[PDB]
Each structure stands twice: as C-alpha cells, then as structure tokens.
Amino acid sequence: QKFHKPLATFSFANHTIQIRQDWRHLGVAAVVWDAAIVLSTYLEMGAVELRGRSAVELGAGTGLVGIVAALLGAHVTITDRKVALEFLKSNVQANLPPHIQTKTVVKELTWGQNLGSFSPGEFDLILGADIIYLEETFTDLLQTLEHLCSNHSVILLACRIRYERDNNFLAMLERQFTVRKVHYDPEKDVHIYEAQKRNQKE
Ligand SMILES: Nc1ncnc2c1ncn2[C@@H]1O[C@H](CSCC[C@H](N)C(=O)O)[C@@H](O)[C@H]1O
C-alpha cells in the first residue's frame, strides 16, 4: 500500500530524502523496500565506518541506502541493472548536494556481467538491501560478491527471508564467506547479515 504512493519521504543524516516511486509502471526497482529503511537506519547508528570509505551498492533500486551512505561520508558507486538505471539516476541526483554528488558514481552493474570493469580491491564496503529473490541469478550475485569483496572489505546484506530459496542463497554465501547476524528488526521482519571472505590466505 506504501508502494502506491508517488513519493516516499525520509529523514536520514540531517537530510530530507524524497524518493519518486513507480510501482504501477516500473515495479520492484521503483519502490523503497523495508530492508532499505532498516539498512539506512543501521548505517546511521554508528557500528559501520563510512567517512571517506569506498562503497558500492548492489541492486540500489531507488537508491535510498546509497543516498544515505553518501550523505554519511562514503564514496559510493550506486548500482543496478540497465532497465533500473534511469530511475535510480533521477532519485540520486535530486537528493544529494553538489559536494556529495562529486564523490558519488551512478553506473550499471548487472550481476556477474562485465565484472572486469571493476577492481577486486576497489570497495571497502559492499551494500545490498532486499536483493535476494531471483534464484536464476543467485550464481551471478555470488560471483559479483566474490569478485568485489577483498580481504579487508565487509558486505552488509539486509534481507527479508520469505521462502526456502532465501536460506539457499545464504548457504551458498556461507561456503566462501563468514555470514553473521548483526541486526534484526521485528516489526519489518528484516535481518542484516555481515559477510567477510573466510579464507583470507586464498
Ligand atoms: N541481475 C541483476 N543485476 C543487478 N540488479 C538486479 C538484478 N536482478 C535484480 N536486481 C535489482 O535488485 C533490486 C531488488 S528491489 C530492492 C531495491 C532497494 N535496495 C530497496 O531495498 O528498496 C531491484 O532494483 C532490481 O533491479
């Protein structure tokens, strides 16, 4: 029902964020999911180092998490697939001051595709809010995390565990990475997992 609203408004990092929404004509990438609100709240509370830190957001959708992380001092590469790009670029540009904008990159990253255009030790922080849902690209997503996550890098995945497939991806993630519960929101039923490369000796 919140999805039907043409505009979703939030207060994060001493700023009013006005997200344009389009559930009807664009769908999933054009609405703010609860996991993006929960992850953005967690980033604000202080357990994560953000100031001057290199960050990438995967499947940003509207871009809330990436916007909040940028406003909190990170150098964020806010990404999604080609079809979501235009709408993502519009919410980012209209919600960031120009001094934050120069430290922000809005570009495409389709999971497991053109991974070579990204440096394996480029990002210290990897973000994803409610991006676990499409079984057909689970391998694509794991190959992206494995390509981007250096030994120092931390992954923060905010999830709504809906079906068996969700636990399956988390088991796939656990094979190569340490996966630890760092936050749980009962009313929104969202868990934030932190992931790190397990065998750092390679
Ligand atoms: N193969 C793929 N490559 C990149 N992004 C993908 C993808 N498959 C799905 N996504 C993206 O994953 C997102 C799930 S919607 C979640 C949007 C946002 N983080 C929020 O929580 O509000 C969508 O934006 C969708 O475009």
From the alpha carbon of 65, which atom of ligand 1 is closest? Answer: 19
143 and 112 Cβ atoms separated by less than 8 Å: yes
- Strand, coil or helix: what is 173? helix
- Strand, coil or helix: what is 168? helix
In CATH, what number is assigned to the domain containing residue 107?
3.40.50.150
CA-wise closest residue to 35 among 168, 138, 183? 183
Q: Which CB contacts under 8 angstroms, 24+ apart, belong to 95-103? A: 95/15, 95/17, 95/18, 95/19, 95/63, 95/67, 96/67, 96/70, 96/71, 100/70, 100/71, 103/70, 103/74, 103/75, 103/76
**Ligand 1 near 61 CB (within 6 A):** yes
The percent helix, strand, coil of the chain (3-state, each to 5) is 35, 25, 40
Cα 201 to ligand 1 centroid, rounded to whole Å: 32
Q: What is the token pair recorded at 171?
A: 């088991």
Number of domains in the chain: 1
CA-wise closest residue to 111 among 65, 70, 59, 155? 59
181: containing domain: 1-202
Which regions of the chain does DSSP assign to beta strands (E)?
7-12, 15-20, 54-57, 75-80, 105-108, 125-129, 154-159, 177-185, 190-197
Integer Cα distance of 194 and 180 in angstroms? 5
119 and 150 Cβ atoms separated by less than 8 Å: no
CA-wise closest residue to 106 among 62, 72, 150, 40? 62
Q: What is the resolution of this structure in A?
A: 2.3
**Ligand 1 near 141 CB (within 6 A):** no
Which DSSP category does 47 fall into?
S
135 and 172 Cβ atoms separated by less than 8 Å: no
Backbone angles phi, psi at 191, to 5 degrees: -110, 140
**Ligand 1 near 129 CB (within 6 A):** yes
CA-wise closest residue to 64 among 5, 129, 146? 129
Query: Which method resolved this structure?
Result: X-ray
Cα 59 to ligand 1 centroid, rounded to whole Å: 3
Integer Cα distance of 73 and 172 in angstroms? 32
Break sites following residues in the chain (C–N > 2.5 A): none
40 and 48 Cβ atoms separated by less than 8 Å: no
- Count of H-run helices and E-run strands, the chain: 6, 9
**Ligand 1 near 158 CB (within 6 A):** no
20 and 7 Cβ atoms separated by less than 8 Å: yes
Integer Cα distance of 74 and 52 in angstroms? 5
